Amino acid sequence: HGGGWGQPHGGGWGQPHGGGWGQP
């Protein structure tokens, strides 16, 4: 979740998942 665009949910892994909340 690098600002709201292509950094969040970047393919399914460490780009979504950011702790355990709404990032994953």
Say which experimental method was used. Answer: NMR
**Token pair 């292509």: residue:** 6
2 is annotated as contributing to ligand binding: yes
11 class by beta-carbon count within 10 Å (0-12 exposed, 13-18 middle, 19+ buried): exposed
CB 14 within 8 A of CB 7: no
What the block records as the tokens of 17 is: 């998942």
19 is annotated as contributing to ligand binding: yes
18 is annotated as contributing to ligand binding: yes
SS (H, E, C) 1-24: CCCCCCCCCCCCCCCCCCCCCCCC
